[PDB]
Amino acid sequence: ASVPSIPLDVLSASNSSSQLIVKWNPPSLPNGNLSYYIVRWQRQPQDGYLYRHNYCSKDKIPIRKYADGTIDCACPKTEAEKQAEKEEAEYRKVFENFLHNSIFVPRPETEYPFFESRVDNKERTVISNLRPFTLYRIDIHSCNHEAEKLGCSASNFVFARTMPAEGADDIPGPVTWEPRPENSIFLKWPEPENPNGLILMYEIKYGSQVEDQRECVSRQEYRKYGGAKLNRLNPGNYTARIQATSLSGNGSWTDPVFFYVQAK
C-alpha cells in the first residue's frame, strides 16, 4: 500500500447553529483497504480590514453565506478531436503527482488549536461543538491501512461557516438613552457576547412617529462611548430601534426604545 490520494469532492453544509455537515467522496487512488478518515477542524480568525473597514462609509459588508444547499442516440467523439481537446488533463496530473509525495502523521487573534477525530466508514460527518457563523477550516486525510506506519494521506482543505445563532446579534440587553443640549441624544447599549461571526456595525432607526431617519455606528466608534450620539432630534417623544449587523447580515432588534427629547 502507498499514501492514499486526497478525499475527492469535499463539500460541507450548515445543518444548524454550532453544527456543520461535511460530505465528501472516497479518494481516487485509496492505495489499500481504506480504514477511516481524519476530520480535523480548526477555528479561523478574522482578517485585517474586518477590524479596520469603517463599514459605515467605506463599502458593502463582506459576508460568507453558509452552503446549506449543498446538502442535496448519443454518439461518442472521435479520437482526433479528443486529443485536440485534451488540455487540462496533464495539468492536474502533475499537480497530483506533486501532492503524492507528502504525508500527514496521525498526531493525537490566531492562536486557535485544531480538533481532530476519526470517522470510520462515513463519507458524512457532523461536528456539534462549533461557534455560530464562524469560519472553520476542515482538513481531511483519507487514511488507509498502515496509515500510522506510512502516514495518512495528503490534506484536502475546505472552508465552511456554521448557522448563525437565532437572534443573537441583537442587543443582548436593555438600551439606555441620555438627553443632551441642542436636543441631542446619546444611546448606549451592550454588545452581543456571542455574535454570528462578528458585529460589523449597528443600525439605529429613529424618527417622528416612524423610524424614518437612519444612523450607522461602526465597530470601533461604539467603544468611544459604549454607543453613539445622534446630534439633533426634534423636541418630542421619540423612538429608536437598534438592529445590529453581524457577519451574517442584519440581525434582530430588541425594541424601539423610547426617550424624552422634549421638556416637561
Binding site: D47, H53, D59, K60, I61, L99, S155, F159
Partner: protein
C-alpha cells in the same frame, strides 16, 4: 544595479525553509523556481526570511501547498522580470492551493516576457482581481482566477488610498494594487517593454521592466536583449556569443559548461555549441560540431464560426485596443474580419437608485474591415462610455459577402481627469432660518454617470462634517440643502463619484451668512 549577484541553476525546495538558504545571494536562476509542499512551516518562519538579491528568473515561479505563507512581499521584494523561456503548460507564474495566502506582494514584477498566469483554488486569497495582467502579460487569454476568496466572498481588499493607478479592462475599472501597501505601477505604451522610472521618464530600449537611471543601458534592472558586462546590449560584439538568449558569454565560458557535464553528468547539462554566434544547447539542423572545437559546421547538404474570445483593453480616453482569436471553424479562407460597435446605454436603475447605503464605494462598473490582423485600435470614442462590440469573421469577397454569425462583447474607454471634476464655483442660498441650499454645476460629460456627491463643509474653527448626496436628493433639490447652521463663514469641499471611481475634490469654497447681529 544591473550586476548585483551570481547565477544559480533551477532548484526544487520542499518540506522546509532550510534548503532555501542555498539561494540566499542569488540574483538570477537559470531555470525554474519551485517552492512547494511546506506543511509543518509556520508564519513566523517566513517573517524573517527574504531574498532581495533575486531580481530575475528565467523559466517561471511556482508555489503550491505552502502553508503559513501569507504574502510574498518579503520573500521576493525585488523580483522584477521573469524571462519565461520555458512555460508550465503555458503558465509562467503558478500559485495553487495556497491556504494562508491573502495577497500577492510581487509589487516589483513588471513584465512576463512569455506565458500566462494561473492562480486557482486559494480559499483565503484576496488582492487577486484588483490587478491588470495586460500591463504585465502580453497574452492574457489563457489564465485562471477561480475558487478564490475574492471571487465568492468579495474580499474588498482595498488599495492604498491615503492613489494606486486605476486601469481599464473591457467593462470594469478598478485600482491596481498587490497588497494594502503597494500600488501596481503601469507605464505608457510608448516603451511597453523598456521599463519605467518614478517620474515617468521611460527606460532605455535595452533595459527590461525597470531601470535605476532614465535612458541608460548600464543601470538597467533587467536586460531586454542579451546582457554583457554591466550593460544591456542589442547584440554583443565579437567574440562573445549569446547564451540562454539573455546574457552573452565568451568562448571560454560556454566551453567549460560543455566539458563539465560532459563527463560528470550531474544533470546532463547542455553541451553548448557556438552556432549563429551564440552558445546554444544544440546547434540547429543542417549543422554539426567540428568534433574538435565547439563551433558547429554545416554538413554536406544533409459561414465561419464565432470569433473566439474577443477581449478589449483601453489605454486612453479616446482609444480602445481590441484583440481576439480566429474562429474555431473558419469554414473557408478568412478574407477579412468584420467589426461592428455601438455605444451602450447605462442601466436605468443607476440614474435613480440610492448610493449612500452600505459604504460609499461603487461596484467595478458602423462597421470596419480587418485584413490579416487579429487586433484593431478604435478611435473617436467617448471616454468611459460602454461600447457593445460585434465581431464576425468573413471568408468571402464583398459581392459575395456571406460569413459567420454576430459575436458580442462589451467595451469601455478610459475615464478622464477633469471629466468628473465639478466645474464652476459652488453657490449658496441665504435663508432666515439658518437653512442653506447649495448649488454646484456638474460637467455635462461624466465618465459614465455621476452617482452621488460627497459634500464636506465646516465653519471656521469647527470640525469637518461629512455628507452623502444620493441620486434622488440632487434630483429634487438640484443639490443639497442644510438646516440648522451656526452663524459664521464656512469652508466647503465636494467630490463627485462616478462609475469611474471617486473624482477630484473641489477647491475649499467659503460663503458668508448674515449673522443677524450687525
Amino acid at each position: 544595479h544591473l550586476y548585483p549577484g551570481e547565477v544559480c541553476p533551477g532548484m526544487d525546495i520542499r518540506n522546509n525553509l532550510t534548503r532555501l538558504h542555498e539561494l540566499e545571494n542569488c540574483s538570477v536562476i537559470e531555470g525554474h523556481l519551485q517552492i512547494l509542499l511546506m506543511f509543518k512551516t509556520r508564519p513566523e518562519d517566513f517573517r524573517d526570511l527574504s531574498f532581495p538579491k533575486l531580481i530575475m528568473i528565467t523559466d517561471y515561479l511556482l508555489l503550491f501547498r505552502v502553508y503559513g505563507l501569507e504574502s510574498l512581499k518579503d520573500l521576493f521584494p525585488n523580483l522584477t522580470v521573469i524571462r519565461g523561456s520555458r512555460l508550465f503548460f503555458n503558465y509562467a507564474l503558478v500559485i495553487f492551493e495556497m491556504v494562508h495566502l491573502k495577497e500577492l506582494g510581487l509589487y516589483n514584477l513588471m513584465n512576463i516576457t512569455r506565458g500566462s498566469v494561473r492562480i486557482e483554488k486559494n480559499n483565503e486569497l484576496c488582492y487577486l482581481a484588483t490587478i491588470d495582467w495586460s500591463r504585465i502579460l502580453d497574452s492574457v487569454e489563457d489564465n485562471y482566477i477561480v475558487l478564490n476568496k475574492d471571487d465568492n466572498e468579495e474580499c474588498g481588499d482595498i488599495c492604498p488610498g491615503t492613489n494606486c493607478p486605476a486601469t481599464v479592462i473591457n467593462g470594469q475599472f478598478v485600482e491596481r494594487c498587490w497588497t494594502h501597501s503597494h500600488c501596481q505601477k503601469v507605464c505608457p505604451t510608448i516603451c511597453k517593454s523598456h521599463g519605467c522610472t518614478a517620474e515617468g521618464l521611460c527606460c532605455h530600449s535595452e533595459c527590461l521592466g525597470n531601470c535605476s537611471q532614465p535612458d541608460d543601458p548600464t543601470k538597467c534592472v533587467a536586460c531586454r536583449n542579451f546582457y554583457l558586462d554591466g550593460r544591456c546590449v542589442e547584440t554583443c560584439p565579437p567574440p562573445y556569443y549569446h547564451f540562454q538568449d539573455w546574457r552573452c558569454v565568451n568562448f571560454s565560458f560556454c566551453q567549460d559548461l560543455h566539458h563539465k557535464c560532459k563527463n560528470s553528468r550531474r544533470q546532463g547539462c547542455h553541451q553548448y555549441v557556438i552556432h549563429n554566434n551564440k552558445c546554444i544547447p544544440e546547434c540547429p539542423s543542417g549543422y554539426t560540431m567540428n568534433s574538435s572545437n565547439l563551433l558547429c559546421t554545416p554538413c554536406l547538404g544533409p459561414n465561419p464560426s464565432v470569433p473566439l474570445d474577443p477581449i478589449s483593453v483601453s489605454n486612453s480616453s479616446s482609444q480602445i485596443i481590441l484583440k481576439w482569436k480566429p474562429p474555431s471553424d473558419p469554414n473557408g479562407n478568412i478574407t477579412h474580419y468584420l467589426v461592428f460597435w455601438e455605444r451602450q446605454a447605462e442601466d436605468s436603475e443607476l440614474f435613480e437608485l440610492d448610493y449612500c447605503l452600505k459604504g460609499l464605494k461603487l461596484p467595478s462598473r458602423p462597421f470596419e474591415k480587418v485584413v490579416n490582423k487579429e487586433s484593431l485600435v478604435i478611435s473617436g470614442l467617448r471616454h468611459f462610455t460602454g461600447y457593445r462590440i460585434e465581431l464576425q469573421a468573413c471568408n468571402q469577397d464583398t459581392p459575395e459577402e456571406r460569413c459567420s454569425v454576430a459575436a458580442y462583447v462589451s467595451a469601455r474607454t478610459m475615464p478622464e481627469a477633469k471629466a468628473d471634476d465639478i466645474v464652476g464655483p459652488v453657490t449658496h442660498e441665504i435663508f432666515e432660518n439658518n437653512v442653506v441650499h447649495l448649488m454646484w454645476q456638474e460637467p455635462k460629460e461624466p465618465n459614465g454617470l455621476i452617482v452621488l456627491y460627497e459634500v464636506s463643509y465646516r465653519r471656521y474653527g469647527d470640525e469637518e462634517l461629512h455628507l452623502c448626496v444620493s441620486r434622488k436628493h440632487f434630483a429634487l433639490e438640484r443639490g443639497c440643502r442644510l438646516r440648522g447652521l451656526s452663524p459664521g463663514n464656512y469652508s466647503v469641499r465636494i467630490r463627485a463619484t462616478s462609475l469611474a471611481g471617486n473624482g477630484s475634490w473641489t477647491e475649499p469654497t467659503y460663503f458668508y451668512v448674515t449673522d443677524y447681529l450687525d
